[PDB]
Design a binder for this molecule. Structure first.
Ligand code: PT1
Length: 268
């Protein structure tokens, strides 16, 4: 019959999505990821991996679409990573890259008849290669997300083709995980929705997506707030600039992955 623990579900439909409904979506996702506050330098920290019960390890994001089809993604609460998805009576997972993760995964969609684990991992690195295109060439926006939910849904019956599915994962990851991770990327998807525009991310968006782990680390290691090494970012035009300390990042980044036990207190 059973196992334990039902994960929090947050719903969102692309059918007539507005700025208000997407803002609400992204704030409920963050509200469910960070359990109130471990805060370093005025940015909340994500739950620490070691010592976190399986019962609090995942959150579910149910996406429905104008064609009345739904796909539920499963995100890991430690890093907001999309670990797999469920479409009807089938579940698919990216290859776990260590064993506690592999077994954490077995708690996720236990009721489905048909569960599969892909051989490959789910990082942008592999996804782009499978999709046959870079994130710079893939359009983001409500129309793209609508389309992606259908592709994900028909993978199960052979509608398929792995390029298309890999490509639909890139769209989902950026509009949900990255938007939750960065206030700037939530802003970028919000501009696309308020104008019913679809367009690829420019270099400023992509370089923050590649830099998140490193930004999380530099901020938690910083002496007072200054980085022991500057992170190199990009402007919309492609030019690079250095970031020397946390302060300019506070309106840009929304959540950081846990890296270190907090050296001072500050969070109370
Ligand atoms: N499936 C998937 N889902 C994501 O949310 C994601 N995010 C990024 C952005 N960068 C990373 C990379 C690694 C990790 C970590 O190990 O914790 C987190 C974020 C890249 N690929 C990703 N792939």
């Amino acid at each position: 019959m059973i196992f334990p623990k039902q994960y929090p579900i947050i719903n969102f439909t692309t059918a007539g999505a507005t700025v208000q409904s997407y803002t609400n979506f992204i704030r409920a996702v963050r509200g469910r990821l960070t359990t109130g506050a471990d805060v370093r330098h005025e940015i909340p920290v994500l739950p620490n991996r070691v010592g976190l019960p399986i019962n609090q390890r995942f959150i579910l994001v149910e996406l429905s679409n104008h064609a009345e089809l739904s796909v539920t993604l499963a995100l890991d609460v430690t890093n907001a990573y999309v670990v797999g998805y469920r479409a009807g009576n089938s579940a698919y997972f990216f290859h776990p890259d260590n064993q506690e993760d592999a077994e954490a995964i077995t708690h996720l969609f236990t009721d489905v008849q048909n569960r599969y684990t892909f051989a490959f991992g789910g990082n942008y690195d592999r996804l782009e290669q499978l999709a046959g295109n870079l994130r710079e060439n893939i359009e983001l926006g409500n129309g793209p997300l609508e389309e992606a939910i259908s592709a994900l849904y028909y993978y199960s019956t052979g509608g398929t083709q792995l390029p298309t599915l890999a490509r639909s994962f890139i769209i989902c990851i950026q509009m949900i995980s990255e938007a939750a991770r960065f206030q700037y990327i939530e802003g970028e998807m919000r501009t696309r929705i308020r104008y019913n525009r679809r367009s690829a991310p420019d270099p400023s968006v992509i370089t923050l997506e590649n830099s998140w782990g490193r930004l999380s680390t530099a901020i938690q290691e910083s002496n007072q707030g200054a980085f022991a090494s500057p992170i190199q970012l990009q402007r919309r035009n492609g030019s690079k600039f250095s970031v020397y300390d946390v302060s300019i990042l506070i309106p840009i980044i929304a959540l950081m992955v846990y890296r270190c036990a907090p050296p001072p207190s500050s969070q109370f």
